[PDB]
Design a protein around this ligand. Structure first.
Ligand SMILES: OC[C@H]1O[C@@](CO)(O[C@H]2O[C@H](CO)[C@@H](O)[C@H](O)[C@H]2O)[C@@H](O)[C@@H]1O
Ligand SMILES: OC[C@H]1O[C@@](CO)(O[C@H]2O[C@H](CO)[C@@H](O)[C@H](O)[C@H]2O)[C@@H](O)[C@@H]1O
Ligand SMILES: OC[C@H]1O[C@@](CO)(O[C@H]2O[C@H](CO)[C@@H](O)[C@H](O)[C@H]2O)[C@@H](O)[C@@H]1O
Ligand SMILES: OC[C@H]1O[C@@](CO)(O[C@H]2O[C@H](CO)[C@@H](O)[C@H](O)[C@H]2O)[C@@H](O)[C@@H]1O
Ligand SMILES: OC[C@H]1O[C@@](CO)(O[C@H]2O[C@H](CO)[C@@H](O)[C@H](O)[C@H]2O)[C@@H](O)[C@@H]1O
Ligand SMILES: OC[C@H]1O[C@@](CO)(O[C@H]2O[C@H](CO)[C@@H](O)[C@H](O)[C@H]2O)[C@@H](O)[C@@H]1O
Ligand SMILES: [Cu+2]
Ligand SMILES: [Cu+2]
Ligand SMILES: [Cu+2]
Ligand SMILES: [Cu+2]
Ligand SMILES: [Cu+2]
Ligand SMILES: [Cu+2]
Lengths: 345, 345, 345
């Protein structure tokens, strides 16, 4: 008896995002999405460590869903018979029934259809939450993604100015808890169930073994670096379902940042580093001003460099020597400065 | 020589709050509170682990004190002779003398009276701080609570609109550091003094063994779930004297959130998850829109599910199918969708 | 071909700050700074633990640089031949080339000159970042500081009111990762290179052994406490290049706080505790209202009291009994209150 037009959305794997409008003149629709749970072995680091992952749609993170304020979101959650345990979904964007979790518990072989009204604007986490200690285990096994609820007039700066992005990426950050043997080597398991007890022991100490973007160390570097061009305004949505993060674009800034991720709040301007509280998504716009490689990290640099949490942007364009220049290339230190430099020891 | 009316306040145990007005037409008063230090053995988890706690008024957290801007707060701190060590109090709401700590050090058998002017609006931590390494030990042994300094016109949205709560709860979150023996079992001690050396070693590694609301895992679930009704605007004050938290109302939102907890700042709107920086209190309003069970957690879900940091609300009322509905109950996956679902692996 | 006046700045060791104007009527200048890298053994705690530090200008943190919006900042980075490895610099204030890191890699015996335009107002981290796992190692070995880019009209409250400080201090917070032997004693090394492998193992577990201000436990206490006077408005800049912090002025507040550190954003008012996200600087103003000792901490009190993260202010002036008073000094508990006090157990 909800008498609105239906609009079917085909999700795409992160860090890319399905087609959508920012500002729209469409009225509310029933926006139809399908998420299929896949338990699978995944590679999580550069040394080939494997992990018995649990995912929405086969990815870590799960895909970004994009709708507008006042849309209804009708989600078909599917739990294929090849999976081994029950799964459900909690949308932080939704109101009631534990975000949908109390209405979406499905055994392998089942599917369920949940509808929730998009009454709250922002980027939000969604994640599996089957009950009790399965909640954090499913989440840190990979069962989390995000949904973006745009205002119908698109983003604004909180001061009556339209903001429009030329390009959007979704960076899901994942804390992983991989058991080690007595020698310190990561252990392999044949099934998520078999990994559980040893994994819970690692989780209890609250220190991840890996902190990764798009499901693995190096996922968003090399061949898979994120592309942009000088002059493009890029929206970077960052989610972390379980653990804090502090995103930073090395060589750039956050021109407009919704740290808490909710578009009813004016963004902060000109940030160096922002903060994603665990259990949320945030978003930053940046207009690229310089070409070259940028590193996008969590700015616990140990996590970024040593536990997997670095992405790269490769930005095409022309260097701006006014914003930054190498005045003198590396050269031998001159002897006339010896005394003066002795004051800086 | 302070010539103001005196108003005696009877504190109540958390998560409840003593009677108070939001908006008031009273002038400044000397608001009189008594806190009695109690060192006692307490049960902190569902498996019956005990802990040599140190508390204000016998609870973790200590009770919420509520006053208005411009009140004077006259605190009688009592340290009964049955206690074993000196205690004092630091009010983050207060100006000078280390928040009062430098004026309130009392041995067992003594009491002291401190007055501080409520010049700063917000929710604030108070905690014991006797000196040196006793400061964190007393705090993580339970000696912390909060005080709320309301504007005399009550809360506002920072945009000239009154906000009024129908119901207030105080959620004190406590990080606990319980030693284990060689087998991993929590160790028991006969006195706080005896627990100290082993406890300090756990504290030094910065990883709590337990993270609890209202002093124990499960405190605010079952018989002790928090009650509300659809339509009620509920203020949830959350404090953490030592360690960060990221509160989230599962199935709800923060309609108005003062993350940093200070009412001279406009609240943020529509948050999924907020952030309580260790050593502070914050506050969130929410108007319940749906009945049923809600989980209120720190959204490090390992802490929430596995270390004790889950509360429940039980909300009475009528379900709103417009905000959320189960369109189709769990059903066998249909064979016609096989090919299409293969794209989501 | 940049045709602007040159202004040479002599840096001073933290927590002090070189001479500068807040509001200025000068036009843009090329502001000339020199940073000299010094690898050296440093003492980091009260028990005399040593550490093979790597620094800018011989200090942890590196010195605070102060410029105005629209200045160009011409940095001569020097890597003396007595050092053992390559170093560079990333300015979070700068746009392009990984903050300057991709233009400033210098071997021992070399120097380089980088110019970056100060287009972004705020306090910002700068740090070494030579590549890969050297990035966090160099940073947590001490190679970080901060730069402040003031608006040309000085600070404002975001509501068209000038804010002016009478006194500025720069508090650099440093997370340190010092290996221990089998007995738990901190280990000593002859060179940074020799310390690396054991240090990386500690870094990987994300738990610092020490958390210090101005490079060592106790640095800013006793003889080196920070001075102020009642009535002075003090700007406290706090940076943390790698790890979150939650600053708190015990006995005071943050009157105006830029938690994220960027002056294009209105400050928050009346904070108890604020949050420095790792990889950033923030800033707080406070006008002292009371004399006496204040403790300035990170309000993980375990870090503050037990891992080194306490500074002191010594504030001269007259006590204000209206803001706070000891109404009654410690006295024996009276027998008439016995029954009533039994309700607070
Ligand atoms: O009390 C509401 C409770 O039920 C859920 C599902 O588990 O939504 C349902 O609520 C009622 C059942 O008690 C019905 O009125 C409604 O039709 C049903 O969908 C939860 O969302 C909520 O927690
Ligand atoms: O980390 C402890 C210890 O384990 C070893 C192998 O014994 O390496 C493991 O840990 C490294 C750090 O996580 C990984 O790079 C590697 O994949 C894993 O086998 C040692 O090398 C290390 O000292
Ligand atoms: O310098 C102030 C210092 O003293 C305290 C108490 O320990 O408040 C006191 O301050 C003065 C004593 O030096 C007196 O003028 C005043 O009467 C007294 O209460 C501290 O609050 C402060 O740190
Ligand atoms: O946690 C390590 C190890 O210790 C054991 C008992 O040897 O359990 C202890 O730790 C559990 C997790 O904190 C608690 O649930 C329990 O109360 C405590 O005795 C093992 O079961 C566990 O592997
Ligand atoms: O693609 C830009 C890239 O180069 C750097 C230095 O490593 O700045 C340089 O950029 C170009 C070289 O590819 C030149 O046009 C420019 O002169 C030069 O300084 C980096 O900052 C940036 O990442
Ligand atoms: O901390 C573990 C263990 O090591 C010892 C010496 O064996 O002390 C070391 O650690 C202390 C805490 O960091 C330091 O204060 C000290 O400098 C260091 O040698 C033990 O005393 C302690 O139990
Ligand atoms: Cu699941
Ligand atoms: Cu959640
Ligand atoms: Cu105490
Ligand atoms: Cu405190
Ligand atoms: Cu370096
Ligand atoms: Cu950086």
């Amino acid at each position: 008896d909800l008498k609105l037009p239906r609009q079917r959305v085909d999700l795409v794997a992160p860090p890319f995002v399905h087609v959508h409008e920012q500002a729209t003149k469409q009225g509310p629709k029933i926006m139809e999405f399908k998420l299929v749970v896949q338990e699978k072995k995944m590679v999580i680091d550069e040394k080939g460590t494997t992990f018995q992952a649990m995912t929405f749609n086969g990815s870590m993170p799960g895909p970004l869903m994009v709708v507008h304020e006042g849309d209804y979101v009708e989600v078909t959650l599917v739990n294929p018979a090849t999976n081994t345990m029950p799964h459900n979904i909690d949308f932080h964007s939704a109101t009631g029934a534990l975000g949908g979790g109390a209405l979406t518990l499905i055994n392998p072989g089942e599917q369920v259809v949940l509808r929730w009204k998009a009454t709250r604007t922002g980027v939000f986490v969604y994640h599996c939450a089957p009950g009790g200690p399965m909640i954090p285990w499913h989440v840190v096994s990979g069962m989390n993604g995000a949904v973006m609820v745009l205002p119908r007039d698109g983003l604004n700066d909180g001061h009556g100015h339209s903001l429009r992005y030329d390009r959007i990426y979704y960076i899901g950050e994942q804390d992983l808890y991989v058991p080690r043997d007595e020698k310190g080597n990561f252990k392999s398991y044949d099934s998520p169930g078999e990994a559980y007890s040893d994994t819970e022991e690692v989780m209890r100490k609250l220190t991840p073994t890996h902190v990764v973007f798009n499901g693995k160390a190096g996922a968003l570097t090399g061949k898979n670096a994120l592309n942009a061009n000088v002059g493009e305004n890029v929206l970077i949505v960052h989610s972390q379902a379980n653990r804090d993060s502090r995103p930073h674009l090395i060589g750039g800034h956050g021109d407009y940042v919704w740290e808490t991720g909710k578009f009813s709040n004016a963004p902060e301007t000109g940030l160096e580093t922002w903060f994603i509280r665990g259990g949320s998504a945030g978003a930053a716009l940046y207009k690229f001003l310089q070409p070259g490689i940028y590193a996008y990290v969590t700015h616990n640099l140990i996590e970024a460099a040593n536990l997997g949490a670095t992405a790269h942007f490769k930005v095409e364009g022309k260097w701006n020597d006014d914003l930054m220049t190498q005045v003198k290339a590396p050269a031998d230190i001159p002897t006339g400065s010896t005394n003066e430099n002795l004051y800086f020891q």
